[PDB]
Design an enzyme around this catalytic site. Structure first.
Site, PDB file in Angstrom:
ATOM      1  N   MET A  12     -37.193 -31.276  13.966  1.00 37.45           N
ATOM      2  CA  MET A  12     -36.834 -30.008  14.635  1.00 37.45           C
ATOM      3  C   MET A  12     -38.017 -29.141  15.085  1.00 37.45           C
ATOM      4  SD  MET A  12     -33.578 -30.796  15.176  1.00 37.45           S
ATOM      5  CE  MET A  12     -34.296 -32.474  15.236  1.00 37.45           C
ATOM      6  N   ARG A 100     -37.893 -30.555  18.602  1.00 40.97           N
ATOM      7  CA  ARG A 100     -36.652 -30.347  19.270  1.00 40.97           C
ATOM      8  C   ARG A 100     -36.691 -28.982  19.926  1.00 40.97           C
ATOM      9  NH1 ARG A 100     -32.897 -30.120  22.056  1.00 40.97           N
ATOM     10  NH2 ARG A 100     -30.798 -31.025  21.703  1.00 40.97           N
TER      11      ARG A 100
HETATM   12  C1  CHD Z   1     -33.464 -19.858  11.900  1.00 44.62           C
HETATM   13  C2  CHD Z   1     -32.034 -19.456  11.548  1.00 44.62           C
HETATM   14  C3  CHD Z   1     -32.039 -18.346  10.480  1.00 44.62           C
HETATM   15  C4  CHD Z   1     -31.048 -17.213  10.796  1.00 44.62           C
HETATM   16  C5  CHD Z   1     -31.587 -15.795  10.652  1.00 44.62           C
HETATM   17  O1  CHD Z   1     -32.387 -15.354  11.510  1.00 44.62           O
HETATM   18  O2  CHD Z   1     -31.184 -15.073   9.712  1.00 44.62           O
HETATM   19  C6  CHD Z   1     -31.196 -20.665  11.092  1.00 44.62           C
HETATM   20  C7  CHD Z   1     -29.725 -20.310  10.820  1.00 44.62           C
HETATM   21  C8  CHD Z   1     -28.925 -21.611  10.941  1.00 44.62           C
HETATM   22  C9  CHD Z   1     -30.012 -22.654  11.171  1.00 44.62           C
HETATM   23  C10 CHD Z   1     -29.615 -24.051  11.659  1.00 44.62           C
HETATM   24  C11 CHD Z   1     -28.574 -24.649  10.720  1.00 44.62           C
HETATM   25  O3  CHD Z   1     -29.047 -24.516   9.372  1.00 44.62           O
HETATM   26  C12 CHD Z   1     -28.246 -26.122  10.979  1.00 44.62           C
HETATM   27  C13 CHD Z   1     -29.493 -27.015  11.144  1.00 44.62           C
HETATM   28  C14 CHD Z   1     -30.053 -27.530   9.790  1.00 44.62           C
HETATM   29  C15 CHD Z   1     -31.252 -28.504   9.956  1.00 44.62           C
HETATM   30  O4  CHD Z   1     -31.785 -28.944   8.684  1.00 44.62           O
HETATM   31  C16 CHD Z   1     -32.367 -27.866  10.801  1.00 44.62           C
HETATM   32  C17 CHD Z   1     -31.820 -27.327  12.136  1.00 44.62           C
HETATM   33  C18 CHD Z   1     -30.569 -26.397  12.077  1.00 44.62           C
HETATM   34  C19 CHD Z   1     -30.003 -26.401  13.499  1.00 44.62           C
HETATM   35  C20 CHD Z   1     -30.871 -24.928  11.681  1.00 44.62           C
HETATM   36  C21 CHD Z   1     -31.968 -24.267  12.517  1.00 44.62           C
HETATM   37  C22 CHD Z   1     -32.336 -22.855  12.050  1.00 44.62           C
HETATM   38  O5  CHD Z   1     -33.034 -22.964  10.814  1.00 44.62           O
HETATM   39  C23 CHD Z   1     -31.108 -21.938  11.954  1.00 44.62           C
HETATM   40  C24 CHD Z   1     -30.653 -21.554  13.370  1.00 44.62           C
END
Ligand code: CHD
Ligand code: CHD
Ligand code: CHD
Ligand code: CHD
Ligand code: CHD
Ligand code: FES
Ligand code: FES
Lengths: 359, 359
Positions: A12, A100
């Site tokens: 990612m 990604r």
């Molecule tokens: C970065 C953000 C944190 C939210 C916040 O600002 O409070 C988090 C919330 C949900 C997350 C996503 C979700 O946890 C689902 C995915 C889990 C995978 O292990 C990585 C990508 C993944 C697609 C994540 C990317 C990122 O870390 C996200 C978008």
């Protein structure tokens, strides 16, 4: 020499500096594979702008950015060295990073690989355990690239989409675990409780049929076997956000739960990722092992070192690629089964891109 | 000759005839290990009367009762006959049967074991993968029995509390799978999608640290490894009831899912239980393979045969006991760690009973 075989290293990614936090969040709030937002095109840049502070702030507490790319690079270098030797008939190998959601992006790497006129291209996921949210998304990205650019690959593609139980992967973990046990006081070694910890998934994803929890579980059992069941363990999940249900037990709740009940000597073992990043350095080390773990049993909490520079991890990576070229395998047998509750038209097309590949 | 070693074979049990249904559910709804009903003593006999017809009807659809006891017995006899030749120093062996909710009840059998003045008693759960609702509750019963008689054991006690990857259990599974694959039209074999299916748990239980999903998962991997990944798989879960959330994906939805997505050749493989019972004869065979599925895309669905009388499973059993006797172990290391979010005060007590045994 002109490089023959390219190894696309997929992950990612994380923001390299605080300055990257914004565009990182934008690309992920715009990816319809993970999110379906109302007026997504307007909310995405807004949500990102409104959440940039908080996240820049997290990276601040860990020295100001993600080291993911640095480790990826060292790992990249070691693998290639070994491979130019393991199979000379596959000529010069070259590794490429394809994050990604940060630079170098998947789309940018595929582009460079094309330009170097490589004949063979291997999508090598850096998640040992497959999720549709992680590996799947990387692989959709390659499919979509060629769909968008509207030209076929000028090179021969296959994928290493999973590897939860690779024998050297298992060893690096076991090695890293023992040498962490040695760092606990001998008076408390046997009492040490192990928590294997990995990034959770929303239940809605779990219930769709994501292979991940089952594979992550296989990685755990393979390592405990090699460790000869020397300490009690338990597998727990981190990184939940939002009000919705996710797969538990949560790592945090589990840490606190163990303390309240007299289990104050806890080893954290991150089991679903191969190097340091925000999940280890901010979440486990700061949020839990520092702030949370004081306020409960302040006895011992340690964290197994990420595989990072470990030369054996290098050897692991190369042996995978090598074993994969030697087998002519286009992808795991598993990739040929989309999850039984899939609602994304793309996974089928992605899977057919890999199974269909010339040669 | 005087029986020297007693092997307590533990299982939840099921109604042996339609007449045993009421008292089966009564005992079950009275167990404050699985339930907390308000005025539980008043509510339970009622919920039993309430639910007897429909369950009686389930048993009716499969011959009129549960075979779990017939298979247990056979498995016991083979196990004993083998143990008397592997471990002669442990004199003659006797197997006993402790069902949680039907005769012979755990308490009933412990009594018999005492009366034979055995010098050794082994609690051998018949769940290869540990849950606190399955094995835990069996083990709780042993503790409680002795608690509620103000007496100590007049015999030496230990437990085999899990065995999710014993190498001969794995083989038996794989053999029954292979064997089931040849019953498919030869043209359709490589097309077979495998669903390993296991009784689900409610998320409240998963979320407090229950070791069950992770171990079941370990079993699946180890079976697939033995089969060299010949067909794609997916692990799914059955037997959900009530409006609360359970761990998915549900087996029923997954079947219907695959059919809608062009995957019409399915091999269902029960993986968390070692003989036929309501789950397999009724849920899988009738509800899902017959009614469901025939009303989606037809095209073949089969179930792998339960281990039942496989002489190989009988070797697995003895192999386990023989090993456990010789290791001089009291219980798994895993047992010495309770659920990180346990709320049941009896779990600590039960753990101590085993870890505290003289020897
Ligand atoms: C970065 C953000 C944190 C939210 C916040 O600002 O409070 C988090 C919330 C949900 C997350 C996503 C979700 O946890 C689902 C995915 C889990 C995978 O292990 C990585 C990508 C993944 C697609 C994540 C990317 C990122 O870390 C996200 C978008
Ligand atoms: C859409 C996705 C679940 C995917 C699915 O239904 O299959 C859900 C699960 C948790 C969600 C995230 C969390 O609720 C936290 C964030 C809250 C913000 O208002 C939107 C982004 C935000 C980062 C969410 C985006 C997205 O809706 C997530 C990632
Ligand atoms: C999953 C759950 C375990 C209990 C728990 O986790 O607390 C199981 C174990 C025994 C189960 C019960 C028994 O198998 C017998 C009944 C089976 C019927 O099909 C539903 C109700 C029924 C009465 C079950 C409800 C539920 O699925 C129980 C209670
Ligand atoms: C509140 C409680 C769930 C316990 C919990 O999870 O906290 C639920 C689950 C089982 C329910 C009971 C049983 O389903 C049996 C009865 C059925 C009727 O539909 C409601 C009253 C009835 C007597 C129920 C009352 C209440 O809604 C119970 C006791
Ligand atoms: C009595 C009731 C069904 C009502 C009926 O068929 O008439 C049964 C069937 C499903 C059962 C419930 C389900 O097992 C889900 C719940 C979780 C635990 O099993 C205990 C309480 C729990 C709430 C159960 C209590 C009770 O036995 C229920 C509610
Ligand atoms: S969501 Fe897993 S295959 Fe589409
Ligand atoms: S609930 Fe698992 S130990 Fe008490």
């Amino acid at each position: 020499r002109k490089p023959k075989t390219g190894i696309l290293m997929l992950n990612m990614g994380g923001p390299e500096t605080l300055g990257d936090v914004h565009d990182f969040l934008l690309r992920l709030f715009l990816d319809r594979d993970l999110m379906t937002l109302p007026i997504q095109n307007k909310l995405a840049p807004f949500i990102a702008k409104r959440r940039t502070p908080k996240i820049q702030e997290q990276y601040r507490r860990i020295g100001g950015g993600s080291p993911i790319k640095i480790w990826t690079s060292k790992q990249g270098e070691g693998m290639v060295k070994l491979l130019d030797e393991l199979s000379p008939n596959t000529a010069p190998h070259k590794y490429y990073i394809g994050f990604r959601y940060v630079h170098p992006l998947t789309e940018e790497a595929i582009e460079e690989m094309e330009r170097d006129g490589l004949e063979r291209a291997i999508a090598f996921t850096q998640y040992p355990q497959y999720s549709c949210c992680t590996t799947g998304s990387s692989l959709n990205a390659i499919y979509r690239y060629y769909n968008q650019v509207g030209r076929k690959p000028t090179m021969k593609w296959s994928t290493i989409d999973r590897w939860p139980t690779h024998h050297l992967l298992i060893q690096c973990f076991a090695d890293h675990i023992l040498k962490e046990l040695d760092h606990f006081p001998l008076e408390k070694r046997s009492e040490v409780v192990i928590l294997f910890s990995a990034h959770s998934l929303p239940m809605s994803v779990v219930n769709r049929g994501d292979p991940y929890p089952q594979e992550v579980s296989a990685t755990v059992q393979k390592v405990m076997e090699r460790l000869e069941y020397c300490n009690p363990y338990r597998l727990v999940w981190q990184s939940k956000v939002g009000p919705m249900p996710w797969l538990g037990p949560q790592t945090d709740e589990s840490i606190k739960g163990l303390c309240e009940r007299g289990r104050k000597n806890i080893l954290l073992v991150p089991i679903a990722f191969t190097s340091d990043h925000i999940e280890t350095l901010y979440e486990l080390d700061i949020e839990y092992s520092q702030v949370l773990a004081k306020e409960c049993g302040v006895e011992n909490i340690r964290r197994a070192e990420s595989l990072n520079g470990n030369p054996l991890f290098s050897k692991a990576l190369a042996d995978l690629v090598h074993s994969h070229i030697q087998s002519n395998e286009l992808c795991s047998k598993q990739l040929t089964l989309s999850c039984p509750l899939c609602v994304n038209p793309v996974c089928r097309e992605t899977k057919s891109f890999f199974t269909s590949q010339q040669l």
